[PDB]
């Protein structure tokens, strides 16, 4: 009766238009305003290749533009059919990593790499998409989270982790790589500079409880219940003012993201201003080629 | 023998000139350089209305300008005479909240709102007064700390919380509101970005011990001893160089507050320069209409 | 000639007791005039001056029928005909602990029991944080703390003939290590700002305009007339938008304080929506809120 | 007319564009992207924004393109007026933002569909793309149109017809992001506040004096000079140009800025033998040998 | 058998050229790419005087420039021969502190102070050296860490602390001093603003375990094993890509250090660019006085 | 015509061994002159040049009788009469690991066992952090890293006739991604700074002055004479105030490092007080401190 798999097929439906997905799965909950986005290459611990990043971007972007979706659950499928091992995401697929970055290939191995096509590092675009979308993204760490996979959990708004199977391991420097952006600096804004430097410089494996104690993981859950708890967290988020939740996310981003953070938060303020009679008077005055009349609108202080 | 009330009336005296306070109480300790500032509307869990904010500002401002006061203890009176419930502060009084913010009213309910008078959100001014005053402000959370009340706690330099009665709950998004300034972004600089986002996005109730573990509460105390512990903390603060304590507070504020932070710290540096013979030579040379002589004052490196 | 046109201005009720500052409301416009009134010492401010200045600016901030503040200096000097906006802190009553309250004009009347203050910094923040445009009209010398006040204002207009900018801080052993210096660098760039402070030279209106700290140069007699024209153009726009724009300009430079002020106004904007009103109503009626009428935007 | 048709070719796959034009230079690694609604001073509606994003994104991913020229077509067939871009099309502005419509006017708005403000997405795309974007202001630049020039890396402006006018507060709108705060990092806080608070009209020469316009050119020569600038840019080390742009963005853009600059530093490390040894060791399931690679200081 | 001393004399060799050191010791490990740098005035709890600072800077600078050294262990020798008391570092030597700062003296006490020579506060230069050097610096807190000694610990990349003997006490304000830089503001980026303010404003003594719980100490070790654990941590660090480790340290520093942070990280990016064929084409074209040919080098995105 | 007036300058004791740099102290003023001395390669620096430049600037930093550093280039070139401030890194000894030490002048003599360095960045930080005003006198070409050196100096004066600013970094596949670029933008604004780097055009003294990166333009023969005048005006003010001001200008731009330096100086001011001394004395006398004589200021 105890399931080894967090996924409950009865609770989830495929999303229309996404039959061609190979490296990623995308479900919408049967009742809730919540979607499930998951890595789908468990044979390589859910390592992503450039095509994986493209699918992940497409799917997250679709969720961003779905008005009836409030929360994204980001996770990994499994286990490995080869050894039963569990993974959230093991970062960039090393098999198709070249001197210019991760390269598109016709097959799974290095020999099928299109040598004419320069490599990319555009998981960074997925990071920004997660960061900038006006919806809460909750990472469900159901297994190994290593390299770029570790950095993905870091950039999510919230993280829940499997007690039995979550393993956090920043392996970047082991393979001569490094996430010098959100993966490292933003980790320091969750667990502090000392712990963050330890995690990267020594590359040790941490449990869910250890990461929770340090401040990068919000709560620990039983593996079988990880998505159930995820859905409960999403339900609590979706039960509040969506307008307030949106502003709050951009408020938490703002200063850390400089002018970009201000752009997003100020953008939402501009939308709020557009709803007002005062802004409509401004529009109407222009269209009617007359001076605007601001006298009904007080100078708040 | 066990008091349900943290307040020890024998230890405190009313402050002269504060006759007319209705929403707030203001005491000076009988021996120590410490004052007690408290919300005084326990029947509504110490929610503040614009008049409450005005009294609070005036009282904190007086404490700021009192040379014989080193530490402010900010707390809530209680319990509710209606149900015996304890509160530090439950944020803005929802009864007089309008479309333009919290509105002045002649009575307690929405019907007595002065409709000719625009709403205000100027608890933010109290936040800055606490932030900018050259004295340590310790928040003693003696009960519910919710909404704007939670955010007041966040902005204080230090927080002590009642074991039995403190309950931290960020209810902003529940009533369609949000503190997008110190309430949220500054919380993240105490407990890290993941926990701060959790606290706001889910709006769960946290105990003193839980908040202490996350990093927003300095210590947990027995309810009956909360002000006693507060006074002990104040005494330790007051036993150090007042000049060093002043500079240290502005040093902690500085970068987080940008140019405002620099302004406050540099302002105190200017005062230190004014104490020197070199600065006195500059003033005198101008007043005597002669060139200054800097030769007695060596260059340091 | 004199930039002050007495016919255009009325005294503000409740301010009969002002000694170091004058305060007028325009006869027709949503504009006030705030001016230093010690031209015999080049409009140097003492602590009492600062108190009056703060109180008057605070009153303008809280006047809903006022949109723009014009900050300037009265003159000329009755002693030598010299023109000044403001020459900074009154050096006569500067002590080792800062500028001190005194019953008279000189150090001999200083209240020795009372520590000195530097709370022009409080006026700077009041100017910086108020949800209204403050225009500095530099009608003469602007030196020391007076120079730093023009720097922190949103806009500066300057008298062609008589405006003189001179950062004399380091000459008398002082320094504005806040807005006076760092924020000046965000107007004229780090090289020019360092020059202005390190060498303490005198600059004309036109020179400051070329460097970027002065918005426009006006004829002396027309300085307040041009100020009123600028104020009128500002007052012809959405007050809501002007308010948001000022705080947007402040935001990143002011860190968490900047975010607090801008987000504070964003919160007011949310409070105006039906969605926020449903949040209030549900709490008051002790029922669950119903968010279904309010769509998610992206 | 600044447009020289002989110098430009249409780009394959963009036959369906209606609000925007998109050309590639016949010889140079340079593209031309232009607003194409001159009858309303090149105001953009959400469809314009979608086309603009799609086109700039394509330019970003085109390895044989080094520089983007962003401008407006004209003149107005109605009054001969010249415009770069007048910002959001006010006719279809609603309480929820700019709304999709089947026609040009408010009565054709799809009421079932919420409005958007996603010109901000185009701003970020210009900002984050590893190529220089030069704005050619050939006419009116107002509202969101003014803000689009602000966010471009460089701006060249028509002496006779460029008109800069930040009208945001006139119509109760505001760009509280790059449009204003970033303008201040070009012309300084005093001038930026003046531009927004008063919303006056400025010439090319005035904006050049303030620091927001790199150079003024004769109207007929505006695109010719743009192409000359693009050529000088394309003649340098592309790797260095790329690093330079993100270095300029970095601190102003906080963690996002660091992410972009560090992303390119990561690529540079991937080129090294040391990084390749890291990949090889993992793939071959053996310990890495770092001894051939010395520590630098 | 149980050693009271963390130092294992068999594991360390003196470094050539440092025979003249008096206030500091400097060893290189017999096998590992690791050095040991230690305060050597245990009779005054390893308080530093200006000569100590000069030696410390010299030794750390030499380590910075040693290509075969990857990690610096920074600690204190002991115990005091007077009372057996243990110290990492008790900050500035108060005996030779004057009105212009810490002063050079021929002897140990104030009467041998060179009055003609202005005082200095240049432990700040050692702080920046630790901060900016492209190698991990691990602080081994083997006893008291107080005042400026506490701040040195704060600025190191990692801290390990002796269970039995580590005592953290920020005493600055007790003696009228303050570290308004890394000592305070950077501490806040490790333990959060509330705990950081508490540490300074109250100046209480904290254990290794307490500082670890707050986030300023990475791990607690047995006193006899402190340097053994230090060596184990260094070995894990030294087993990764040295290039990646370097980039990662400056990535963690970057935003916190503004333009200085950008300068250091960008400098390393420039070195990486110099390794490329493209950069070499740039150099060669200039030297051969011909136009560069960039056509072999793809634009990446 | 030469800007250098030999009569005004004396060699500094202990610096006889300098080869790539010259170092003089003024015969009367608290001012030194530090100059690149390889005019045959447009004053391009090699690693040895950087070491000498650091040592000389460090010595000036620690000299209590020196207030101002004038940083410039010697010339003209004995080969073609060309004038240079500094053309950046010596490309002849640039390798894949950076600029390399060599026994001779050319690439064939580089020590292959010794990795390259980019440590002109250390000189930039030394200029940036030293508590004294550094004025760059651009007497000729300023290119690459040489351009970045002027950018990081506090003030820049430039020769009308011979100053030439040209950011050639991207021409040779290099880039200054720190103070050279990002800090230039805080002088001339983001548009002009991007223009300067992306196109790498040559600009005159007058053009750079208009953009905001050059404080003043001077006649070539008078460049050091004007430099000495600027230094004299700087040296006539409170040294303590000038010091605080420089770190105040640095502060926010330099994050925790900026704060560290400014607060460090504030700590020194505090050490001068009776209050700080009571703290010391109480510790030394093993007694509680008595803070009662020292008032709380606000
Ligand atoms: C360039 C002038 C403005 C005009 O000179 P002029 O030749 O035209 O007239 P002058 O003879 O100097 O002045 C006329 C009368 O006014 C007096 N006076 C002018 N300014 C002041 C003044 N600030 N304080 C006291 N008296 C002043 C003069 O002494 C003189 O008095 P009289 O001989 O008729 O008896 C010149 O007077 C002057 O340099 N005055 C001093 C400017 C000054 O150093 N102000 C204060 C420096 S510091 C500062 O303002 C300040 C304040 C608060 C701060 C807070 C935080 C951080 C920094 C702060 C700060 O830097
Ligand atoms: C200064 C002009 C550009 C030139 O005036 P001119 O006197 O030469 O010609 P005019 O007769 O006014 O315009 C010619 C035709 O084009 C129309 N037109 C011009 N601009 C627009 C326009 N923006 N929207 C709709 N129609 C426009 C005019 O109504 C007119 O139509 P007609 O009566 O001949 O049939 C003037 O047209 C004008 O003020 N246009 C409006 C400028 C404007 O306020 N744009 C919107 C500001 S708000 C905005 O762009 C925007 C968008 C997204 C944002 C996202 C986040 C944050 C902020 C945002 C934002 O602020
Ligand atoms: C907590 C202790 C470290 C341990 O106390 P314990 O109870 O174990 O034994 P104790 O009797 O106090 O010390 C044993 C011997 O060591 C001496 N000693 C300990 N620390 C110092 C010390 N720092 N300076 C001079 N002597 C010291 C003691 O006086 C005593 O001497 P003895 O009576 O045998 O002759 C305690 O000694 C103590 O508080 N020491 C002072 C800590 C302190 O306040 N240091 C200076 C704060 S300021 C700071 O370090 C500093 C320095 C440079 C800075 C530069 C720029 C900006 C900031 C700076 C800065 O903040
Ligand atoms: C614009 C000139 C300065 C003047 O041109 P002109 O036509 O007047 O004279 P020219 O014939 O080019 O030069 C005269 C002699 O001096 C030589 N020369 C001039 N500059 C250099 C030079 N920098 N290195 C080596 N030789 C140089 C010339 O090769 C030539 O040698 P000759 O033919 O007599 O044997 C031109 O010479 C020139 O562009 N020189 C190279 C400028 C350059 O690209 N420098 C390196 C950019 S990168 C850089 O400096 C640098 C260094 C360290 C960094 C560290 C961290 C981050 C960034 C860094 C960085 O960007």
XYZ file of C-alpha atoms in Angstrom, chain E residues 283-284 287, chain F residues 38 45-48 89-117:
37
model
C 46.526 40.565 -29.998
C 48.202 39.199 -33.140
C 51.117 43.328 -33.310
C 57.750 54.002 -21.686
C 52.400 48.892 -19.097
C 53.921 45.462 -18.552
C 53.747 43.548 -15.243
C 56.937 45.201 -13.957
C 48.622 46.583 -21.414
C 51.801 45.871 -23.360
C 50.444 43.531 -26.081
C 53.951 42.188 -26.814
C 53.997 40.223 -23.573
C 50.300 39.357 -23.422
C 49.775 35.604 -23.410
C 46.809 33.305 -23.012
C 47.027 33.585 -19.210
C 47.354 37.385 -19.191
C 50.312 39.811 -19.148
C 53.578 38.003 -18.505
C 56.904 38.894 -16.936
C 59.755 38.853 -19.425
C 63.514 39.372 -19.224
C 63.382 41.564 -22.339
C 60.894 43.799 -24.139
C 59.420 41.303 -26.547
C 57.398 38.130 -26.615
C 60.381 35.820 -27.154
C 61.735 36.627 -23.690
C 58.676 35.822 -21.542
C 59.259 33.494 -18.572
C 57.233 30.489 -19.746
C 57.190 28.996 -16.245
C 55.328 32.004 -14.878
C 51.588 32.534 -15.350
C 50.213 35.859 -16.604
C 48.506 38.498 -14.479
